[PDB]
Design an enzyme around this catalytic site. Structure first.
Site, PDB file in Angstrom:
ATOM      1  N   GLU A 296     -87.818 -62.384  51.663  1.00 47.82           N
ATOM      2  CA  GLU A 296     -87.828 -62.433  50.184  1.00 47.82           C
ATOM      3  C   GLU A 296     -88.692 -63.610  49.731  1.00 47.82           C
ATOM      4  OE1 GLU A 296     -83.625 -61.764  48.883  1.00 47.82           O
ATOM      5  OE2 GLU A 296     -84.640 -59.841  48.525  1.00 47.82           O
TER       6      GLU A 296
ATOM      7  N   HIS B  16     -75.770 -62.486  54.873  1.00 48.80           N
ATOM      8  CA  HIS B  16     -76.449 -61.199  55.012  1.00 48.80           C
ATOM      9  C   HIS B  16     -77.914 -61.472  55.229  1.00 48.80           C
ATOM     10  CE1 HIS B  16     -76.935 -62.282  50.859  1.00 48.80           C
ATOM     11  NE2 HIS B  16     -78.150 -61.728  50.960  1.00 48.80           N
TER      12      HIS B  16
ATOM     13  N   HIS C 157     -79.490 -65.108  54.454  1.00 47.35           N
ATOM     14  CA  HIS C 157     -78.910 -65.784  53.297  1.00 47.35           C
ATOM     15  C   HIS C 157     -77.464 -66.113  53.596  1.00 47.35           C
ATOM     16  CE1 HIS C 157     -82.072 -63.922  50.504  1.00 47.35           C
ATOM     17  NE2 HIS C 157     -82.503 -64.994  51.144  1.00 47.35           N
TER      18      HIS C 157
ATOM     19  N   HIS D  25     -82.121 -59.765  54.707  1.00 49.77           N
ATOM     20  CA  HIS D  25     -83.120 -58.845  54.163  1.00 49.77           C
ATOM     21  C   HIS D  25     -84.179 -58.670  55.219  1.00 49.77           C
ATOM     22  CE1 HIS D  25     -81.459 -59.520  50.066  1.00 49.77           C
ATOM     23  NE2 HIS D  25     -81.120 -60.688  50.599  1.00 49.77           N
TER      24      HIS D  25
ATOM     25  N   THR E 160     -81.038 -62.383  44.268  1.00 50.02           N
ATOM     26  CA  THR E 160     -82.235 -61.558  44.463  1.00 50.02           C
ATOM     27  C   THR E 160     -81.966 -60.067  44.387  1.00 50.02           C
ATOM     28  OG1 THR E 160     -82.021 -61.433  46.836  1.00 50.02           O
ATOM     29  CG2 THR E 160     -83.273 -63.357  45.960  1.00 50.02           C
TER      30      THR E 160
ATOM     31  N   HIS F 148     -76.694 -51.829  50.757  1.00 45.29           N
ATOM     32  CA  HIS F 148     -77.973 -52.595  50.457  1.00 45.29           C
ATOM     33  C   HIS F 148     -78.272 -53.524  51.641  1.00 45.29           C
ATOM     34  CE1 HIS F 148     -77.496 -51.066  46.328  1.00 45.29           C
ATOM     35  NE2 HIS F 148     -76.283 -51.682  46.253  1.00 45.29           N
TER      36      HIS F 148
END
Ligand SMILES: NS(=O)(=O)c1c(F)c(F)c(S(=O)(=O)CCO)c(F)c1F
Ligand SMILES: [Zn+2]
Length: 258
Positions: free
Chosen positions: A104, A92, A117, A94, A196, A62
């Protein structure tokens, strides 16, 4: 048929396996800057990363996680809106398929190219798995990424990515210093929210920095060469691994600054 980021198993489907997806304190949210409340009693954030011990970097299918030794108070977050002490466990990102999306959280509906994050757990719960079962279990420091000049402290992450291309790969990742990922200012917004991704647990104090960091097009391009699939499966580029903004419901976002 597990959760992920598509038509078929993306954010709009998650609620069937994880019904809190429709809960009262889900994340991310849009940060309406004009409506955020300045709280003069919010403290400066204390980010104490000098003793951080990174260990490993992992493609989990992911995102990729940079992991830390969280068996002692080395790197910790405190102050800000928090009580007590939160230990860094991993960070990590996104990101998007295009520079125009990927974050996000949004700021006045603005999307950034990516969002970092830095994940911390409340030491009063003893370890991360207990902490996620508590409403004050985690503090996640969110930092927006915009594309422009390179972030030199990021390159050490970008360059290891080809060793973890596919899901399940890991590589040793020692001596990475997360202080190189911070912007100059620690001014922030804060609100109570959730993980999230599934399991979407409502255990997070979110602390979102106002100042983005800049990363280069080449850096973010390397994120987009990662794969959601495992080795020996059809290639699915790891892009658009973000959850859209969720209803704010009965929450107030607080600003540390005016
Ligand atoms: N994106 S986020 O920072 O909120 C975040 C986390 F930091 C996180 F650690 C987890 S997790 O629950 O550890 C595992 C997911 O299946 C999350 F699920 C998760 F969503
Ligand atoms: Zn995240």
């Amino acid at each position: 048929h597990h959760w992920g980021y598509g038509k078929h198993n993306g954010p709009e489907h998650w609620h069937k396996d994880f019904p809190i997806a429709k809960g009262e304190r889900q994340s991310p949210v849009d940060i309406d800057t004009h409506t955020a409340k300045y709280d003069p009693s919010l403290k400066p954030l204390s980010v104490s990363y000098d003793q951080a011990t990174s260990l490993r970097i992992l493609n989990n299918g992911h995102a990729f996680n940079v992991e830390f030794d969280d068996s002692q108070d080395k790197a910790v977050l405190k102050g800000g809106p928090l009580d007590g002490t939160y230990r860094l466990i991993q960070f990590h990102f996104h990101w998007g398929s295009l520079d125009g999306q990927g974050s996000e959280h949004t700021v006045d509906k603005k999307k950034y190219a990516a969002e970092l994050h830095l994940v911390h757990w409340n030491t009063k719960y003893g370890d991360f798995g207990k902490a996620v079962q508590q409403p004050d279990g985690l503090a996640v420091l969110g930092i927006f990424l915009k594309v422009g000049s390179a972030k030199p402290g990021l390159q050490k992450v970008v360059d290891v990515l080809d060793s973890i291309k596919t899901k399940g790969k890991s590589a040793d990742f020692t001596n990475f210093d997360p202080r190189g990922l911070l912007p100059e200012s620690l001014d922030y917004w804060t609100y109570p929210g959730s993980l999230t991704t599934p399991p979407l647990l409502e255990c997070v104090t979110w602390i979102v920095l106002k100042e983005p960091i800049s990363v280069s097009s080449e850096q973010v391009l390397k994120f987009r060469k990662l794969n959601f699939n495992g080795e020996g499966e059809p290639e699915e580029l790891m892009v658009d691994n973000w959850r859209p903004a969720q209803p704010l419901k009965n929450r107030q976002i607080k600003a540390s600054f005016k």
